[PDB]
Design a protein around this ligand. Structure first.
Ligand SMILES: [Cl-]
Ligand SMILES: [Mg+2]
Ligand SMILES: [Mg+2]
Ligand SMILES: [Mg+2]
Ligand SMILES: [Mg+2]
Lengths: 243, 244, 195, 195, 250, 241, 4, 231, 204, 221, 4
């Protein structure tokens, strides 16, 4: 054997074990979700409070690309940052040449091709992050989830990290119970609940909730963080549902 | 990364030998024997073709003996493909010297440069060495008739008579026995063939399994002529010495 | 003499057919209206070689854009033209009018002068012969004209530009961009001269 | 720099080279040796652009000396001249060419013959019985055409050379402060101290 | 990132073998039989068209390729490796010869250039040798008709006739019995078809056999008239119909 | 045994990395089929959306390379999209350089040559994909050309790819034995799509809803994919016969 | 160059 | 085991061993403490000597007038990363006439460390850093790990027996955070914090290294007789 | 400072019955100053003859360059280069230096060893091939040579007659040019013998 | 003087046979009709070496392209490759070409200027004699020309250049590219400038020329 | 260079 020692090597199965090993690093990470809604997308993430000494609200994990795209990831946080830095360069060169802000599907392939490139050579390591991202473009709302292999699809709801199965189950219910669609303000409250429910799989350390959203009506198509009254309203909603 | 798959071609053994050079020489020891004999009035190059097939085109074939310029030729022992890379380099180097100095390149200068290229492949670049040993037969107005050999190590030495390739041990003993300094070309032709005829792994030495060449001053007055022997000319010289 | 005019149903491009090498007319039936995409065309003025090389690169960029992200906007096409014209301003003599039809944005006209600046306008005129019809075009142009009104406006405008500009002449080619599709029009001297 | 002469006779090559180094309205030096020994039996005189002359001469000298050590053998005058010509032939199409004219006087030990080569800064080589660079030629060539014989001795060659220096001292506008004379023969290179 | 493989993947073993070249020759042995026969007035090269699927159109896959108007090539071994070699072989005939001398290279020199490309894959960093043996048939004014074999090592040999690949050992024996120095081109085509029938197992017709000749100039295939010195290509690919005509009088 | 990790020869003259790339082809467990009409070339592929949270519109293994050329992939989506983007760039550059639309068979050869390089050069791995290119070429007419990780390519009368490729292959072979011709003798592309789906249903033995299939159609001067409703209309036509 |  | 040869290789459980071995170099390093109030941010570093004849390895480096860090692990790697910060701080000043935000300083270090963990040939940084600074959003303390993970904290400690000081600060959190407009009292809390990581050795005059930055205080380092006040 | 007219010189080539002739002056000067009366401008590589006029440094350089190339040609092709092929090699080599050219006017002359056909060709400094049945001219007295050759030349001249025609064409053209003359050489080329004659001409 | 004329079932191009250096006729019978591919021919004006070199380079790359694509080369391919090459060199390659030929797409006629601009037309003329030629073309050209009518119009347009333009002279070269047929290259289609018998033979009595030295030259090895 |  030895097929798992080098990146870009096919096993006799036709598998790249180094990419599958990167997925294990993602599974180890904190829970992050994405919810597609009527006219936009909502992102939420679990931030484990390791110590009292962590400054609340001042270790921000959700990142913005351009002005209209939100990116969140689970796994190796630095690898996620490296991918967003690339995303920002890709989105900048698109706007520079074509004037219009990068469409979400266009942007999704730019990350997809870049992550896939890191499975072609033994001189590079695959990305240790699954990235949930999306936003609002000319064709409306788009939610995407991108995996270490370079695989990505469009999603109604997306979840990754240690509490992915719990979050996926809760997401599948929302899709069933709301066939006509979920509103932006609802999706923020549901996002809070699903992070709190997904926290059961990581319940040693207590956590800090962080939500962002893009909405054509609520945020005018731009990416904004949920803060203050709207954040505390979503936390209270989540607290009421666990009890 | 790629470190895993690196053979490390340019390293020393604990005994202070170059693995790849030693193994390249082992490769050459299986190649058809090539003999060079230097006489007072010319040089002979004789070489045994590697187990010939009856349907091989013999007359329009070149395997062992190559022309570098009008005054210098080489006998090859090893990978033909490797030799042709080095030969085209040697041919260019000769023309560079002629272009620069308006004089035909001295034999040793050409040999040294070709040997220096082989040396490079043993000390840097992480590539395999050239699996080739040359016998250089040439003439210049400084040292006259000269025989050299170079090997994959990039080391070269001068000779009165020398063999490379297969059965060099046996071939060198026979040359060392019958060679003398006042020897003529026609005598050296006979010695070269008699040596191959005894060291050959074949049943009998025939015209179709030989390449032959002489570098004489046998042209008209104080000028050198290169003669790459034709099949029929090898057939005649083989009968004339009484081998067939 | 080239111009592009927006109207109710979309946009119309118009141009003369004269190519000059000094005072000699190298080509009297030139097509100065070039398709960079299905419903994005451009008007070329300045160096024939420069505008040709630019238009070819833009056509390539928008073909590759279409393969990845679908139909580009007229604004996107104008941005690609600008990017080439602006970044190579020292080595280019190209004045290009970009005109296209979206279903959302309807008819749009972008003019790109020598500098490589972009100007989005209701209508645009350019080339040597445009100088003679600034007065006429400003007095006669109206927004939300009909197809027939816009064709007459371009025909009369280029007719005057051709009459006064020695560098302009031959036939008046026009290209109509609407939801209906693409329509090529031609008008011969015997018609437009006696307007 | 300015005056460099060369005369090939029966058994030797004689090079005469002016001693003056002028910059502006001042003769800075009157004892300058405008020559380098390339090998024991090869001497090169030089004239041209300030700095370039010595920089080029010493560069050639270094290369020939390197060859001599490597092969433990003296290059023929013909071989050295060909090498020098190729260096100047490269130079002329460089970013900043060497503006240096040279005479190469050598004794070929294999042929037992003196050889004089005239090479200008373009890399224009000629073998001559007598040679000169600059304005010197315009006086000496016609004088040597008359007085030169191919079978002359070294002493006859020096008298023929004295005749050239006298003519140059009489008709040349600039004071070149006499010449350093050097003889190249079978026994190598030596300098005439009283000229 | 970047190609970190700057070292030889083909090295000498203690026994003096170059493993990757030997293994490449093994890949050639597995490959389908192809042969070449030289006549007095032409050369024939032939091979079996091993179809991957009956739904596949075997006409679209060309095993016999034109390199120059007077030179053709056929192979045994890995088809993809052959395809890229034909691309490189065609280009080098222009860049390193025709764009210099304003005429097509002679057979031996083009073969020499192909051999160089295959030798470099044996020594250069981070590459394996080519998994093919080529048979190159060609004509030029001063050398006449010639047939060359090129091996993965980059070694090439001139042949009166030879075969490579699956049933080469038997095919070579067959050619030794039939070959003489007085063979006319038609006689060489006849022997080529006889030799190839021994190695072919399934269907044996113009649709499963690929055969081309280097013979007389073809003015009809030139595509223009008016230049007397330009008389057309000597390379001609025999049609499916032209093969079946000769299989009746077999 | 490092001769199984990189693209160098094994003692028996094999490239194991190329062979293992072929096995990656079937990782998606999807079967594709391509046939030619008189005027058109139809390609159909199974569409499996297991996750309920997926946006089914974004799940696709058919690609619009140029206006005229369409490409279906059998293999993982990262390598599929890698190949698609490169083919799109190659087709665009070809048009710019040579002043005419890149033919289906020339693009196939170009992508095959790229695939060949990965089998010879060590640092680059093969893509674990089989690319099926379809068009109505302006010279050769209806065209199917298929590429694999070995760098092999060839034209096809018709073809199938995937786990149950052999069952589909023999199903089509038997039809062309019977019809005695190289194509589907049909006027409209609508009925050539109906033929493609019918013969896939017979070979695989499964029934298809509108969301279980993905259809690409190549006509003269455009290649396009069918919507769910375009397929549903097509499925209704088959059922009522 | 030629140059409306 | 088989997956620790280089940084480009993942383990079967999804670990980067070369990064974890780099993390180990920090634990071997001498203890250093970071803590801040709303007005000031303080670094306290226990310096280490080779023997009694040797000097004490300097732990604290200044990056700008308003920013600097303390190191634990490979000192040369700290010199490389501190030099990079100095340049980034300096770039922000010359180009934008703008003092570099302590948060951006962290983001830049994270991205620099990350590139060394994904490429063949290179190695991870073998040092941990505590960055303090005062910018437009008040006092800040960062913890840099060579994995790339940067974390903003009220207080922390890294190095050998850092757990002692980190527990103390976790208890004292409510007290020291409200030491506003009092430098000497915030340092005292930092000196008392590092004292919880001492074994057999005590804080001497050439052993203790303190640094402070704040509202009306440039980043200044105290060594020798200047720290005698706090023993 | 016109590179083509610093050193001066002329070359002329003609065709006869189963023969070719190529002739050149011997002058090398620096503008007004005559420097050498031994500077031959005709070289040969096997049976193919090349005359080169123009800047003398480039004449010498190109001779050395074509000797280099024809030597490698012969080693690889195992045969002497033919005039038609050599002509193409000269054209290639000159056009390679399109935007930094050799200031030369080369002239190829020789008989194809296979066909036996007499062949001549001329080039501009940038490599444009000028093939001709009758004659080629090059140098500072090209106008003069054109006027002489156009009037004196007739087809199918015997070698002995052709010698007189080319010799008179060169001499009388050279005597109306300040930068040409100072001696002359004529090559008479038959299928398998070549005669070289030095002409007596006025030395001013 | 170079012209191109479109007709029923293809395209014809023609050129004069004069090469000049200043006011001097360098070549009285040069060929300005170049082959890019068997059925794509180029008429060249401007810098003689540039028209030959750029035609051969694109002709070489077209042959390689034809072999690569297994397709007969198209005129638009030769047009695209020529214009992108010429444009890259900003007119410093002084090649003014009339590109014409037949391909699977049909029959085509284009012109290319040195700066990299391309035109389309039924009748085109380039070079110093372009105005003399274009005057004839504008006078006599019509839609739906036959082959024999197009050759006549083309050669007539070249003759206008030969007689009236000092830059043009000697003979008329023609190349006819018809669809479905081999392109026929008509070298010296017209020779209306044959030199009249000279009044006198200038054959010298043998020994007229004074000789200093004779020597046998060794061409053998 | 020569120059129709
Ligand atoms: Cl390719
Ligand atoms: Mg007008
Ligand atoms: Mg590989
Ligand atoms: Mg005179
Ligand atoms: Mg005079």
């Amino acid at each position: 054997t030895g097929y798992d020692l080098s990146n870009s090597v096919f096993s006799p199965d036709g598998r790249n074990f180094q990419v599958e090993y990167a997925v294990k690093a993602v599974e180890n990470g904190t829970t992050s979700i994405g919810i597609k809604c009527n006219d936009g997308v909502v992102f939420a993430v679990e931030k484990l409070i390791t110590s009292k000494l962590l400054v609340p609200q001042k270790n921000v994990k959700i990142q913005v690309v351009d002005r209209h795209i939100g990116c969140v990831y689970s796994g190796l946080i630095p690898d996620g940052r490296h991918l967003v830095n690339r995303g920002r360069e890709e989105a900048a060169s698109f706007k520079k040449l074509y004037k219009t802000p990068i469409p979400i599907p266009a942007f999704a392939d730019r990350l997809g091709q870049y992550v896939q490139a890191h499975t072609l050579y033994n001189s590079v390591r695959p990305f240790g992050v699954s990235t949930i991202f999306g936003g609002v473009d000319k064709n409306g709302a788009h939610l995407y989830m991108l995996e270490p292999s370079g695989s990505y699809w469009g999603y109604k709801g997306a979840a990754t990290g240690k509490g992915r199965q719990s979050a996926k189950a809760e997401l599948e219910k929302l899709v069933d119970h709301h066939p006509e669609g979920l509103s932006a303000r609802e999706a923020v409250k549901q996002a809070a609940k699903i992070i709190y429910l997904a926290h059961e799989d990581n319940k040693e350390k207590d956590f800090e909730l962080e939500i962002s959203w893009c909405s054509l009506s609520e945020t005018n198509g731009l990416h904004k963080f949920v803060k203050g009254d709207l954040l505390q309203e979503a936390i209270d909603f989540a607290q009421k549902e666990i009890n | 990364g790629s470190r895993r798959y690196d053979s490390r071609t340019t390293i020393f053994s604990p005994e202070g030998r170059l693995y790849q050079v030693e193994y390249a020489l082992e490769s050459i020891s299986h190649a058809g024997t090539a003999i060079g004999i230097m006489a007072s009035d010319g040089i002979v190059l004789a070489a045994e073709r590697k187990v010939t097939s009856t349907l091989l085109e013999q007359d329009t074939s070149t395997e062992k003996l190559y022309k570098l310029n009008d005054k210098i030729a080489v006998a090859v022992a090893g990978l033909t493909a490797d030799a042709e890379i080095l030969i085209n380099t040697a041919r260019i180097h000769a023309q560079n010297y002629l272009k620069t100095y308006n004089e035909d390149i001295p034999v040793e200068i050409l040999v040294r440069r070709l040997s220096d290229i082989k040396q490079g492949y043993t000390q840097h670049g992480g590539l395999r060495p050239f699996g080739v040993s040359f016998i250089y037969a040439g003439y210049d107005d400084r040292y006259g008739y000269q025989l050299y050999t170079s090997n994959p190590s990039g080391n070269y030495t001068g000779w009165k008579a020398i063999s490379v390739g297969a059965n060099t041990s046996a071939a060198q003993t026979l040359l060392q026995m019958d060679y003398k300094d006042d020897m003529k070309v026609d005598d050296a032709i006979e010695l070269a063939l008699k040596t191959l005829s005894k060291t050959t792994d074949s049943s009998a030495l025939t015209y179709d399994r030989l390449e032959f060449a002489t570098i004489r001053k046998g042209a008209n007055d104080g000028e050198v002529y290169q003669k790459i022997f034709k099949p029929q000319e090898i057939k005649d010289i083989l009968v004339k010495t009484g081998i067939t | 003499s080239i111009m592009a005019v927006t109207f109710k149903d979309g946009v119309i491009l118009g141009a003369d057919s004269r190519t000059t090498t000094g005072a000699y007319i190298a080509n009297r039936v030139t097509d100065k209206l070039t398709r960079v995409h299905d419903k994005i065309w451009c008007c070329r003025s300045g160096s024939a070689a420069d505008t040709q090389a630019i238009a070819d690169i833009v056509q390539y960029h928008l073909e590759l854009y279409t393969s990845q992200y679908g139909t580009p906007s007229t604004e996107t096409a104008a941005s690609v033209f600008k990017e080439l014209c602006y970044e190579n301003k020292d080595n280019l003599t190209a004045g290009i009018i970009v005109a296209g039809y979206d279903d959302k944005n309807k008819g749009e006209v972008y003019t790109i002068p020598l500098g490589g600046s972009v100007h989005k306008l209701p209508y645009a005129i350019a080339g040597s012969g445009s100088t003679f019809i600034y007065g006429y075009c400003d007095k006669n142009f109206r927004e939300n004209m009909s197809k027939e009104e816009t064709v007459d406006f371009i025909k009369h405008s280029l007719s005057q530009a051709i009459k006064w500009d020695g560098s302009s002449g031959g036939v008046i080619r026009m290209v109509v961009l609407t939801a209906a599709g693409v329509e090529r029009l031609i008008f011969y001297p015997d018609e437009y001269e006696q307007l | 720099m300015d005056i460099i002469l060369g005369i090939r006779v029966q058994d030797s090559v004689i090079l005469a080279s002016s001693k003056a180094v002028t910059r502006g309205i001042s003769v800075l030096k009157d004892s300058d040796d405008k020559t380098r020994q390339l090998s024991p039996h090869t001497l090169m005189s030089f004239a041209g652009e300030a700095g370039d002359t010595v920089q080029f001469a010493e560069y050639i000298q270094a290369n020939i000396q390197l060859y001599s050590i490597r092969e433990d053998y003296e290059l023929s005058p013909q071989a050295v001249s060909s090498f020098v010509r190729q260096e100047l032939a490269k130079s002329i199409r460089s970013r900043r060419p060497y503006q240096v004219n040279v005479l190469i006087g050598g004794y070929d030990k294999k042929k037992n013959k003196p050889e004089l080569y005239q090479i200008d800064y373009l890399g224009t080589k000629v073998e001559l019985p007598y040679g000169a660079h600059g304005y010197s030629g315009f006086y000496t060539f016609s004088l040597l055409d008359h007085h030169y014989r191919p079978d002359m001795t070294t002493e006859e060659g020096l008298d023929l050379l004295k005749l050239c220096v006298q003519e140059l001292e009489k008709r040349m506008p600039m004071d070149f402060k006499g010449v350093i004379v050097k003889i190249v023969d079978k026994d190598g290179i030596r300098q005439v101290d009283d000229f | 990132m970047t190609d970190r493989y700057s070292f030889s993947l083909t090295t000498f073993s203690p026994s003096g073998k170059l493993g990757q070249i030997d293994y490449a020759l093994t890949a050639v042995k597995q490959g389908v039989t192809s042969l070449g026969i030289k006549a007095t007035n032409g050369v024939v090269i032939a091979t079996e068209k091993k179809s991957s699927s009956p739904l596949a159109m075997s006409e679209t896959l060309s095993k016999v390729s034109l390199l120059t108007p007077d030179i053709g090539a056929v192979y045994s071994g890995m088809g993809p490796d052959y395809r890229v070699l034909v691309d490189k072989s065609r280009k080098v005939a222009h860049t390193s010869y025709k764009r210099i001398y304003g005429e097509y290279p002679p057979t031996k020199l083009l073969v020499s250039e192909v051999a160089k490309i295959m030798q470099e894959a044996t020594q250069s960093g981070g590459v394996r040798p080519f998994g093919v043996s080529l048979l190159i048939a060609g004509h030029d004014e001063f050398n006449g008709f010639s047939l060359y074999q090129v091996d993965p090592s980059g070694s090439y040999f001139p042949w009166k006739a030879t075969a490579i690949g699956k049933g080469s050992v038997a095919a070579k024996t067959f050619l030794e019995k039939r070959w003489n120095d007085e063979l006319e081109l038609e006689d060489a085509i006849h022997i080529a078809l006889l030799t190839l029938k021994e190695s072919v197992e399934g269907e044996f017709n113009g649709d499963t056999i690929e055969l081309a000749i280097i013979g007389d100039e073809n003015p009809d295939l030139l595509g223009y008239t008016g230049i007397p010195t330009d008389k057309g290509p000597r390379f001609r690919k025999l049609t499916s119909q032209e093969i079946n005509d000769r299989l009746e009088a077999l | 045994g490092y001769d199984r990790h990189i693209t160098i020869f094994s003692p028996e003259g094999r490239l194991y990395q190329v062979e293992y790339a072929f096995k990656a082809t079937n990782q998606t467990n999807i079967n594709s089929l391509a046939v030619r009409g008189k005027d058109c070339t139809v390609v159909i592929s199974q569409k499996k959306v297991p996750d309920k949270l997926l946006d089914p519109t974004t799940v696709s293994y058919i690609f619009c390379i140029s206006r005229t050329i369409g490409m279906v992939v059998n293999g993982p989506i990262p390598d599929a999209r890698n190949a698609a983007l490169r083919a799109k760039a190659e087709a665009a550059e070809f048009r710019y350089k040579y002043g005419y639309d890149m033919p289906c068979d020339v693009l196939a050869k170009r992508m095959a040559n790229l695939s060949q390089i990965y089998t010879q050069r060590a640092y680059m791995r093969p893509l674990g994909v089989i690319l099926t290119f379809v068009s109505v070429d302006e010279e050769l007419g209806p065209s199917i050309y298929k590429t694999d990780p070995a760098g092999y390519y060839v034209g096809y009368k018709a073809t199938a790819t995937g786990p149950k490729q052999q069952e589909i292959t023999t199903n089509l072979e038997n039809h062309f034995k019977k019809s005695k011709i190289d194509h589907i003798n049909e006027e409209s592309w609508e009925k050539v799509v109906e033929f493609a789906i019918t013969h896939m249903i017979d070979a695989l033995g499964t029934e298809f809803s509108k969301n279980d299939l993905e259809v690409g159609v190549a006509t003269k001067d455009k290649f396009f994919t069918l919507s769910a409703e375009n397929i549903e209309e097509r499925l209704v036509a088959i059922a009522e016969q | 160059x030629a140059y409306x | 085991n088989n997956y620790d040869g280089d940084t480009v290789t993942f383990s079967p459980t999804g670990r980067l061993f070369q990064v974890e071995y780099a993390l180990e170099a920090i634990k071997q390093g001498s203890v250093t403490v970071g803590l801040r109030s709303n007005t000031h941010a303080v670094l306290v570093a226990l310096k280490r000597n080779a023997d009694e004849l040797s000097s004490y390895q300097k732990k604290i480096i200044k990056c700008d007038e308003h920013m600097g860090l303390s190191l634990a692990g490979l000192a040369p790697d700290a010199r490389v990363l501190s030099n990079y910060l100095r340049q980034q701080c300096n770039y922000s000043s010359l180009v934008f006439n703008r003092k570099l935000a302590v948060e951006r300083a962290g983001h830049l270090l994270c991205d620099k460390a990350q590139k060394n963990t994904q490429s063949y040939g290179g190695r991870p940084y073998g040092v941990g850093l505590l960055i303090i600074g005062y910018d437009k959003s008040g006092a800040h303390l960062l913890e840099f790990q060579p994995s790339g993970n940067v974390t903003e904290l009220y207080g922390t400690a890294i190095g050998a027996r850092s757990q002692g000081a980190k527990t103390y600060l976790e208890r004292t959190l409510d007290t020291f955070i409200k030491i506003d407009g009092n430098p000497d009292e915030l340092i005292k809390a930092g000196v008392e914090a590092i004292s919880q990581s001492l074994r057999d050795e005590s804080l001497t005059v050439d052993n203790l290294s303190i640094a402070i930055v704040g509202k009306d205080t440039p980043f200044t380092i105290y060594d020798g007789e200047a720290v005698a006040k706090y023993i | 400072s016109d590179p083509s007219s610093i050193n001066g010189g002329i070359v002329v080539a003609m065709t006869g019955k189963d023969c070719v002739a190529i002739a050149c002056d011997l002058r090398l000067g620096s503008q007004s100053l005559g420097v050498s009366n031994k500077f031959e401008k005709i070289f040969h590589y096997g049976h193919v003859f090349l005359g080169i006029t123009g800047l003398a440094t480039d004449v010498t350089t190109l001779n050395e360059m074509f000797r280099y190339k024809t030597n490698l040609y012969k080693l690889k092709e195992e045969r002497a280069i033919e005039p038609e092929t050599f002509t193409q090699l000269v054209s290639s080599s000159l056009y390679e230096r399109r935007f930094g050219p050799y200031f030369v006017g080369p002239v190829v002359a020789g008989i194809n060893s296979k066909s036996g056909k007499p062949f001549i060709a001329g080039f501009d400094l940038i490599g444009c091939i000028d093939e001709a049945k009758d004659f080629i001219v090059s140098g500072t007295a090209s106008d003069q040579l054109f006027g002489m050759c156009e009037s004196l030349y007739e087809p199918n001249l015997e070698p002995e007659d052709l010698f007189e025609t080319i010799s008179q064409a060169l001499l009388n053209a050279a005597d109306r040019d300040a930068l040409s003359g100072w001696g002359a050489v004529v090559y008479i080329i038959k299928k398998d013998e070549v005669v070289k004659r030095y002409l007596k001409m006025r030395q001013d | 003087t170079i012209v191109g004329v479109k007709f029923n079932n293809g395209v014809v191009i023609a050129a004069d046979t004069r090469s000049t250096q200043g006011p001097i006729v360098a070549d009285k019978n040069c060929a300005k009709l170049h082959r890019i591919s068997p059925k794509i021919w180029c008429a060249g004006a401007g810098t003689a070496a540039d028209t030959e070199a750029v035609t051969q380079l694109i002709g070489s790359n077209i042959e390689l392209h034809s072999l690569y694509t297994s397709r007969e080369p198209r005129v638009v391919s030769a047009l695209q490759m020529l214009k992108q090459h010429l444009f890259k060199y900003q007119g410093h390659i002084g090649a003014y070409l009339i590109v014409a030929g037949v391909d699977p797409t049909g029959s085509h006629l284009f012109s290319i200027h040195a700066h990299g601009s391309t035109d389309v037309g039924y009748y085109l003329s380039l070079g110093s004699g372009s105005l003399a030629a274009m005057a004839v073309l504008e006078s006599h050209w019509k839609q739906d020309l036959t082959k024999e009518e197009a050759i006549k119009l083309a050669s007539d347009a070249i003759q206008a250049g030969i007689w009236n333009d000092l830059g043009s002279g000697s003979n008329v070269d023609v190349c006819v590219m018809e669809i479905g047929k081999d392109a026929e290259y008509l070298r010296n289609y017209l020779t209306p400038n044959v030199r009249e018998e000279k009044q006198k033979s200038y054959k010298f009595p043998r020994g007229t020329t004074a000789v200093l030295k004779e020597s046998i030259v060794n061409i053998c090895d």
